[PDB]
Every structure is written in structure tokens, then in C-alpha cells.
Amino acid sequence: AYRLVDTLQ
Amino acid sequence: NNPAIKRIGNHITKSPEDKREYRGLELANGIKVLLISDPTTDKSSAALDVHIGSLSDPPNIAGLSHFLQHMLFLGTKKYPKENEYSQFLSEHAGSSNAFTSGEHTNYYFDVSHEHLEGALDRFAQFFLSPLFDESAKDREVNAVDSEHEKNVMNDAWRLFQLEKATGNPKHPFSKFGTGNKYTLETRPNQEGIDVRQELLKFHSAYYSSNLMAVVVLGRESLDDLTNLVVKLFSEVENKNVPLPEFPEHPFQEEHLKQLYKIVPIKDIRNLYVTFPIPDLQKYYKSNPGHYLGHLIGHEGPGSLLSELKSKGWVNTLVGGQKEGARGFMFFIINVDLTEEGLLHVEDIILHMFQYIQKLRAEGPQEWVFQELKDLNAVAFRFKDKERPRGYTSKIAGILHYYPLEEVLTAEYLLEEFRPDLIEMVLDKLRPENVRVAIVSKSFEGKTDRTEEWYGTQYKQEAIPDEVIKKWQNADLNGKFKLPTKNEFIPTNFEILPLEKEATPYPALIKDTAMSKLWFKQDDKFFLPKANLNFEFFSPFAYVDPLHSNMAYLYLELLKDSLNEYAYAAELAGLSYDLQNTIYGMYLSVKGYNDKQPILLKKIIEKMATFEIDEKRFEIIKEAYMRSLNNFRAEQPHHAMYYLRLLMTEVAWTKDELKEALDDVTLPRLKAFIPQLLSRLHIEALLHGNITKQAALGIMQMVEDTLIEHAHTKPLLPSQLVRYREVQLPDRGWFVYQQRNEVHNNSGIEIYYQTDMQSTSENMFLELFAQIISEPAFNTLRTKEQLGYIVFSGPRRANGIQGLRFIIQSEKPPHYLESRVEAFLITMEKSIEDMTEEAFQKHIQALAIRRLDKPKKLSAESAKYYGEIISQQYNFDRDNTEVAYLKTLTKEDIIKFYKEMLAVDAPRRHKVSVHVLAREMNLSQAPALPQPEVIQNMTEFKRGLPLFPLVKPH
Ligand SMILES: [Zn+2]
Numbered sequence: 001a002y003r004l005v006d007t008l009q
Numbered sequence: 010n011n012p013a014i015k016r017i018g019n020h021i022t023k024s025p026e027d028k029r030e031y032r033g034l035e036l037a038n039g040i041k042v043l044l045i046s047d048p049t050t051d052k053s054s055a056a057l058d059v060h061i062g063s064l065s066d067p068p069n070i071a072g073l074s075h076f077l078q079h080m081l082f083l084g085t086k087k088y089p090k091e092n093e094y095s096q097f098l099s100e101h102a103g104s105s106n107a108f109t110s111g112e113h114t115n116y117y118f119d120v121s122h123e124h125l126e127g128a129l130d131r132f133a134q135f136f137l138s139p140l141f142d143e144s145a146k147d148r149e150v151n152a153v154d155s156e157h158e159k160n161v162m163n164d165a166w167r168l169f170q171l172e173k174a175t176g177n178p179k180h181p182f183s184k185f186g187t188g189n190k191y192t193l194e195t196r197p198n199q200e201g202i203d204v205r206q207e208l209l210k211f212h213s214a215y216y217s218s219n220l221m222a223v224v225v226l227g228r229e230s231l232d233d234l235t236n237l238v239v240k241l242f243s244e245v246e247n248k249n250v251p252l253p254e255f256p257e258h259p260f261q262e263e264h265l266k267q268l269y270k271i272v273p274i275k276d277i278r279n280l281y282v283t284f285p286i287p288d289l290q291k292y293y294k295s296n297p298g299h300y301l302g303h304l305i306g307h308e309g310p311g312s313l314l315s316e317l318k319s320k321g322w323v324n325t326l327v328g329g330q331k332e333g334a335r336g337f338m339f340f341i342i343n344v345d346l347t348e349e350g351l352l353h354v355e356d357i358i359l360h361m362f363q364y365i366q367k368l369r370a371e372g373p374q375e376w377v378f379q380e381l382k383d384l385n386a387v388a389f390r391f392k393d394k395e396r397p398r399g400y401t402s403k404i405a406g407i408l409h410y411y412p413l414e415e416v417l418t419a420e421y422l423l424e425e426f427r428p429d430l431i432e433m434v435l436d437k438l439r440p441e442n443v444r445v446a447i448v449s450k451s452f453e454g455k456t457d458r459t460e461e462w463y464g465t466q467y468k469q470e471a472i473p474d475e476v477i478k479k480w481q482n483a484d485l486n487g488k489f490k491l492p493t494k495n496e497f498i499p500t501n502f503e504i505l506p507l508e509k510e511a512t513p514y515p516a517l518i519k520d521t522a523m524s525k526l527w528f529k530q531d532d533k534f535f536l537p538k539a540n541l542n543f544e545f546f547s548p549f550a551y552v553d554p555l556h557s558n559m560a561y562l563y564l565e566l567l568k569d570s571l572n573e574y575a576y577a578a579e580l581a582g583l584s585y586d587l588q589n590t591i592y593g594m595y596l597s598v599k600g601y602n603d604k605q606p607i608l609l610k611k612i613i614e615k616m617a618t619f620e621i622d623e624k625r626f627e628i629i630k631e632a633y634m635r636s637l638n639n640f641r642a643e644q645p646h647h648a649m650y651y652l653r654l655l656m657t658e659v660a661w662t663k664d665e666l667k668e669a670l671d672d673v674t675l676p677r678l679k680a681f682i683p684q685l686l687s688r689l690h691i692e693a694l695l696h697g698n699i700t701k702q703a704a705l706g707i708m709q710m711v712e713d714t715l716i717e718h719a720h721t722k723p724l725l726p727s728q729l730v731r732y733r734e735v736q737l738p739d740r741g742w743f744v745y746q747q748r749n750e751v752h753n754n755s756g757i758e759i760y761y762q763t764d765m766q767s768t769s770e771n772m773f774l775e776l777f778a779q780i781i782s783e784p785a786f787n788t789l790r791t792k793e794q795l796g797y798i799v800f801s802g803p804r805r806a807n808g809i810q811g812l813r814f815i816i817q818s819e820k821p822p823h824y825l826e827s828r829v830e831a832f833l834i835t836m837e838k839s840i841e842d843m844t845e846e847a848f849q850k851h852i853q854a855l856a857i858r859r860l861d862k863p864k865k866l867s868a869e870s871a872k873y874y875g876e877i878i879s880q881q882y883n884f885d886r887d888n889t890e891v892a893y894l895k896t897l898t899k900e901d902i903i904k905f906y907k908e909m910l911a912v913d914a915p916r917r918h919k920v921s922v923h924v925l926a927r928e929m930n931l932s933q934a935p936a937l938p939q940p941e942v943i944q945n946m947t948e949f950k951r952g953l954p955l956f957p958l959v960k961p962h
Contacts, residue, residue, distance in 0.1 A: 001306050001308065001325075001328075002306040002307075002328065002329050003306070003327065003329045003330075003331075004165065004166055005108040005110045006075045006078075006156065006186060006187050007106055007107065008079075008106055008156075008797075009095070009106065009152075
């Protein structure tokens with residue numbers, strides 16, 4: 001096949 | 010002119026299918042803006058992306074920009090109430106979230122279309138005068154800590170941080186972005202830091218208008234939206250902050266030709282190969298890295314993956330470019346490993362370099378670029394209309410990268426063939442700048458390093474000069490060939506005229522022993538696509554744990570067998586999903602209607618004539634075993650899984666499936682398949698750009714292919730069994746307790762069972778949940794800080810329903826219980842005290858939520874699909890249920906709570922799942938009864954009645 005962030009409030 | 014506006018952009022290039030209208034502009038203060046007018050939209054939306062993130066954290070306060078992201082929701086000068094923002098959204102059918110990455114902090118909401126200005130006014134204050142209230146700060150630090158806690162034992166997050174820890178430690182790339190209690194409170198306190206002042210300073214320094222991009226979508230005209238955004242966002246200060254840039258790659262010479270041996274949490278087996286590269290972002294019109302990703306990551310005949318799979322070394326592969334930040338990027342080739350592949354890592358990588366050498370030998374291929382371009386242009390023209398909230402959030406990010414006029418097209422349309430760039434990137438993919446990482450339990454006890462933020466156990470070694478040289482000498486392997494022309498590329502995009510007998514809902518157009526066909530020709534979206542959904546009913550897919558195992562393995566081996574062929578279809582926008590269920594099998598084919606009958610035919614044909622390769626069977630069996638074992642490393646909120654097991658008539662546990670798996674032999678599987686296919690019932694939804702006669706044709710082609718090759722006959726109507734939910738006794742409380750062996754947090758699910766689904770019961774439960782939704786979050790998380798994960802809502806299963814709470818926490822479940830109960834009493838009183846108009850706002854908010862129109866085909870298909878698989882077939886549910894909802898009073902909801910939900914309720918039906926951690930002005934909690942502790946799930950189920958099944962509409 002071709003081709004991590006913190007949320008929230 | 011207008012002094013508040015620096016410039017209005019030219020025409021924003023859009024798809025001719027896109028009826029939304031667009032205006033780009035730049036404000037005098039430097040904010041880039043996109044306005045989107047959609048007079049049909051039920052929900053309006055806005056997002057703002059600040060081009061600053063965790064890479065800009067002070068070296069001494071890790072997580073600060075992320076903590077700031079949480080804190081902005083907790084009150085501003087204009088709107089000081091801690092939950093003013095979230096309460097306003099909830100009462101007006103809205104929702105919000107935000108995220109922090111290395112270089113961006115992105116904030117978004119949606120809301121009922123008539124309340125855009127009110128939501129946007131509150132939102133704008135985030136970027137003007139947040140309070141960073143001292144009490145808010147001390148509470149909310151726990152949400153961030155709990156957020157990190159859940160990531161700690163997650164293999165993906167551990168690898169993410171490990172990559173950072175093994176580059177140049179002086180590079181901002183090495184920073185820990187999440188933050189926690191230690192970095193955000195404890196250490197700052199030890200070092201005399203006033204965190205509130207640090208938040209105020211960071212906001213002041215970096216939240217500059219020149220680094221911001223805003224997108225607003227509403228029903229208003231482009232002129233009205235323009236005045237709105239000028240009104241609200243003109244006052245953001247420009248502090249002329251330079252955009253951070255990172256031209257020096259975090260991986261320098263000494264970080265290259267390195268091998269890392271890593272112990273995972275789950276029993277997984279992977280190989281990560283990475284090469285440092287320049288930032289290719291500026292080359293978006295040619296996209297050299299996507300071209301190489303397409304080729305290296307290909308899964309068709311002649312591919313890298315094909316040969317590695319044939320050798321029995323790897324099952325899956327991902328290749329291509331990966332973002333870093335302004336100034337650096339990575340090119341990756343990652344594979345999972347079979348047991349044999351773990352012993353042949355050196356050979357796997359040689360094959361990677363042989364494939365790369367083949368690319369170098371053939372040179373750049375304009376015809377490959379042309380396909381890529383053609384596919385991107387088709388995808389752009391016929392893109393599904395997006396939900397406003399995700400759309401505004403996405404555009405706000407990319408406004409920082411492309412001219413206003415190109416923001417919609419820039420990620421799609423390719424323009425320049427650039428063999429110089431393709432060669433340049435290809436020149437970076439050499440053994441002398443490779444980093445290699447193997448993830449395996451086999452390194453357990455053999456490691457000498459520990460990553461500090463997550464605890465990851467690893468070992469770092471130089472790759473031997475002799476290994477490098479061997480890879481440097483990779484020559485051409487005759488197994489590697491470029492892909493051939495993709496024959497699934499669609500060319501017929503004709504939209505068939507709407508038939509005279511067309512219906513607003515799916516019509517039942519075939520009702521036989523073998524099949525039930527629901528059909529709707531698309532009357533809304535007018536894109537050349539269709540969704541073809543099939544449930545195959547067979548009692549033999551779930552009769553016992555063994556047969557459930559075989560059903561699974563059968564379909565996994567089938568997908569594995571079709572992969573090479575199906576991959577071309579997938580690139581060409583034609584996909585399928587095939588899985589075993591508790592009732593048989595589910596097949597979904599979606600995308601461009603053109604070639605769709607061809608792929609479908611191939612799937613059923615392969616299904617019904619399937620012959621298993623023994624080597625693939627053994628590999629996939631071993632992967633499945635590990636997959637079952639690995640559930641042990643899932644998160645404590647496990648609680649959901651135990652409740653499902655507890656409440657459903659028939660359910661096999663992961664333990665029972667594990668046991669039965671050794672008894673799965675090849676002979677047994679080969680016998681199972683014809684038996685599974687011998688008798689079936691098929692229920693289908695065919696929905697999209699297709700006529701009644703094409704639908705009837707597709708259905709009968711599926712039947713005829715099964716009849717022909719598998720001798721399929723119809724199932725008896727009585728054999729079309731559905732499972733029931735366990736019926737809890739009036740005033741009963743049951744507790745099931747287990748331990749999570751991996752994570753050091755608790756998880757809980759509390760289920761207050763109400764009654765069978767019906768119009769009245771549905772809307773009592775949904776209104777109550779609407780009313781308590783924001784307060785539960787505010788109380789249990791924001792005020793009491795019980796954990797990051799705090800959830801409440803209706804639970805629906807097997808035609809029955811109730812109210813659930815899900816929490817993950819450091820606090821013991823028995824404590825969590827008393828806090829949920831204390832909260833429930835708060836809500837009764839709160840419902841008594843709320844005005845009749847506040848009550849009506851919640852009815853209206855629920856109404857808007859339920860009536861929100863699907864923006865795309867598959868969203869409409871899924872709604873009909875839910876009616877079909879639940880066998881309620883209530884296609885007009887929304888209008889009917891909302892009409893009834895508008896009828897409800899405060900007394901109705903109070904009486905409902907008092908009868909079904911209150912601690913002293915005569916019809917309270919409560920079940921709790923307590924998952925214990927590995928190591929195991931507050932409102933007044935009521936006294937609780939002694940629970941009956943469930944010792945055995947089978948015995949629990951035996952001793953209770955089973956509910957009826959819901960009658961079909
Ligand atoms: Zn967060």
C-alpha cells in the first residue's frame with residue numbers, strides 16, 4: 001500500500 | 010476598498026459537481042480565510058489552525074502547546090463560564106474538538122445552521138483573551154495526564170516517540186509533545202514556574218494572526234460570511250512571528266546505518282525501514298514521493314510485496330513518503346513479519362533494494378504519472394460531499410501551504426512530470442542512509458536501553474559494513490516488474506435518468522426463499538458510484554467456536570488470495586469489505602459503478618470455488634492466534650467486550666476461540682467451506698447510480714454463481730434466527746469484575762437497561778441522554794477529572810436499549826460507580842430546575858441531530874443498512890420519531906427517570922463491568938445496594954429470561 005496527534009478539549 | 014481586508018482571492022477552483030460557493034481572502038492582520046456558503050447545510054461549521062505546535066514547546070515544559078489547546082475551551086474574558094462554549098454547542102446541536110501536532114494546533118466545531126454567529130463569537134475569544142483560570146488549570150492537567158496514560162502501553166505511540174528519541178537529541182523533533190502531570194505540574198512547581206503565566210506568554214508569543222488560518226461554512230451568503238469573519242477576527246493581534254523551520258534533518262550521519270531491536274507490548278512482528286529525505290511539500294504539482302510510494306508500495310503482480318509474500322516472509326507492506334516538519338521528511342518501507350521473515354530480515358531488505366534498483370534501471374515513467382494524474386482528477390471531480398466539521402478543519406490546515414485559489418485542488422491535481430525530482434528522491438533510497446527497526450518479543454531480555462517517556466525496551470547497533478555493501482550491490486531480480494496499465498480505471502461516468510417508478514426509500518423488489526433485495530436508485534448525489542451490500546445468512550458461521558474460527562480464516566484467506574487482483578480496483582476507486590459475522594458473512598462493494606459488476610463477480614466466483622494454499626493457511630492461522638492473544642493488551646474500557654458477552658444470548662469468548670483454533674486443520678477448513686455455502690439466505694441493499702433491472706441482474710448473478718459452483722439452496726425461514734438480549738430483573742444490580750493485565754488504569758461500563766426499542770421508548774431515552782450529555786462530560790471529567798475517557802449515551806443491541814456510562818480512570822471502579830450515581834441525582838434536580846425553554850432547546854437540538862441530511866451516498870446507505878440488518882425496516886424513522894419527540898414534556902422525562910433510572914426506581918435494571926488496573930464540593934453519592942457478583946457468564950445467562958425480538962415495520 002502507498003503512504004500521531006493529541007486531542008481533545 | 011476595505012481596510013480590514015488585505016486581499017480577496019480570485020475564483021477558488023472547485024469540482025463542477027460542487028454546488029457550494031467559495032471565497033478566499035486575507036485579512037489586514039494576515040489571517041488566511043476561506044468562506045463556504047451552503048444554503049442547504051443543516052450544520053454550520055468553523056475551524057482555525059494556528060501554525061504552531063509541540064515542536065515549539067519550551068524545552069523545559071514539554072506538552073505546553075497541547076495543554077494550552079485543552080485550556081482554551083475553559084473560559085475567556087467575554088465568556089468566562091468554564092463550559093460556556095461546550096454547553097452552547099450542546100444546546101444547539103453542535104460538537105467540537107481540537108488537536109495539536111508538531112507544527113499545528115487545529116480547533117473546530119459544528120453547530121445548528123441558525124446559531125453559527127453565536128458559536129463563532131464564543132470560538133473567536135479562544136484566540137483573543139483566554140482566562141487560563143488557575144483552578145481550571147489544576148484540574149485539566151489531569152485530563153492530559155490521563156490522555157498520556159492511555160498511550161503509554163500502546164505500541165504505535167511507543168514507536169512514534171522512540172523514533173524521536175533516537176535522532177539528534179538537540180533537534181526539536183526529539184520533544185515529547187503530549188505532556189503529562191509530571192511535565193506540566195510537578196516539575197514546573199519544583200522549578201518555580203507559574204504555569205498560568207507560561208500559558209499566557211506562549212499564547213501571547215505564538216497565537217499571532219499572521220500564523221492563523223480560518224474557515225467558516227454556513228448558509229449565509231459569501232458577503233454575509235465575509236462581514237462575520239471581519240467582525241470577529243480583525244482584532245486578533247499581528248505579532249509578525251517567524252514561521253518555525255527545521256532545515257537540518259534530525260537524522261544526521263551518526264543516526265544512519267543503525268539497527269534497533271525493540272520489545273513490543275502486543276505479540277507483533279514488524280520491520281521498519283526508513284530513509285531521511287528533503288521536504289518535498291513544495292513539489293505538490295508533481296509529487297515525486299507519491300509516485301515512488303505508488304510503485305514501491307504496489308501490491309499487484311511483479312511488486313515487491315508479491316515476492317516477499319511468495320517467499321512466506323511478510324504479509325503486508327506500506328511504502329512512501331511520511332511527513333516530518335517544514336524542512337525534513339522521511340521515506341518509509343514497513344512490513345509485518347512471519348516467523349520465517351523474522352529470520353530473513355537481511356534478505357527482505359536486499360529485495361527492497363533490488364526493487365529500488367529496478368526503478369533506477371527503468372527510469373521515470375510518464376505513463377505511470379499519467380495514471381496517477383488521471384485517477385486524482387476523477388477522484389476530485391466526483392469527490393463525496395464532506396461533513397462540514399471535518400471539511401473546515403482540513404482546509405484550515407492546508408490554507409498554510411497553498412495559494413487561496415488552489416486550496417481545494419492542491420492535494421489532488423497533478424500538473425508537472427518531473428523525472429529530475431523522481432531521480433533525486435530515488436538517489437536518497439540507498440543502504441548508506443538507511444535506518445532499520447525490528448519489533449519482536451524475541452528481543453525480550455536482550456535489550457540494554459529504555460526510552461524515558463514510555464519505557465520502551467530496545468537495543469541500538471551499527472549495521473555491519475559488510476551488510477551495507479551487500480545491499481549496495483543489489484542487482485536486478487527477475488521477479489520485480491513495473492505494474493501494467495490499470496484496467497479497472499473507470500471511463501463510464503454517465504448518470505442514468507431517474508426511473509419513473511423511483512422511490513424515496515429502498516423498495517423491496519425481490520422477496521424469495523434465496524434472497525431479499527432492497528433497491529434505491531440515487532435521487533440526491535448524482536455521482537457515478539454505487540454501494541452493493543449483502544448479508545449472507547448461514548447458522549454454520551457461528552454454530553460453535555471452531556466454526557466461527559473457520560468462517561474467519563476462510564474469508565481472510567480469500568481476501569489474501571484476491572489481493573493482487575483487487576489492488577488495481579482499489580487504486581481505481583473500487584473497494585470491497587468482506588467479513589464473517591455472528592450470522593454468516595457480510596460483503597460490501599463500493600465506488601465507481603462502471604467496473605463494479607466485474608469485481609463483484611470475481612469475489613463470488615472465488616468464494617464458491619476457493620482452493621486454499623497450505624502455506625498461506627498456516628501463516629494466517631498463526632497471525633490469528635496472536636490477534637486473539639493480543640486482545641489482552643487492549644484498553645480497560647475490555648469493559649465493553651465483557652458487557653456484550655454478558656448481554657447477548659450467544660457469544661463465544663476470545664478464550665474459547667483460542668482453544669478451538671488448534672483443532673482447525675486444513676482438511677477441516679476444506680470441508681467447512683462447501684458446507685457453509687450449501688444453504689444460504691441473502692439480504693441485499695443495492696443503492697446508487699443503478700437501475701432496477703441492473704440491480705435485479707446483479708442480485709441474480711450473485712445467486713447463479715453460488716448455485717452454479719457451490720450448489721447453494723435456500724435456508725428455511727425458521728433458520729433465520731436472531732439473538733436476543735438478556736432480560737434483567739426489576740431492581741437488580743449485577744457486577745462482573747475482571748483485571749486488565751497490561752494497563753495501569755481501571756475501566757468501567759455501567760448499563761441501565763430500559764426496555765425494547767419503540768417510538769416512545771427510543772425518544773424518552775434519547776432526550777434524557779441529550780440533556781445529560783454535556784453535563785456528564787463537564788461533571789465527570791472537567792470538574793471531577795475522573796479520566797480522559799468519559800462517555801455517556803444510549804446503548805442499542807438486539808432490539809433492546811438503555812443508558813450507558815463508560816469511564817477509564819486511575820480510581821477504582823467502585824469509586825467510579827458512586828460518582829456516576831451522584832451525577833444521576835444532580836441531573837434529576839437539574840431537569841426540575843431548568844426552564845421550559847431550556848427543555849425545548851434540548852428537544853430542538855436532538856431534532857436537528859436526528860434530521861441532519863446525509864451529504865454522501867454511503868452515509869445514506871448506512872442509515873438504510875441499519876434498518877435492514879436490525880430487521881426494523883423503519884426507513885421513515887427520523888420524521889416519525891422527531892414528530893413524537895416534539896410532543897414530550899419535562900414531566901414525561903422526570904417520570905421516565907423515576908420509573909427506570911433513579912437509584913430507587915421500581916424498574917431499575919443495572920449491570921456493571923469493572924475492569925481493574927494491572928496493579929490493583931463533591932456532590933453527595935447515594936447509598937447503593939449490595940450487588941450480585943457474576944461468577945460465570947453462562948450461569949448468569951441461564952438464570953434470566955430473554956427479551957423478545959423487535960417486530961418489523
Ligand atoms: Zn489532549
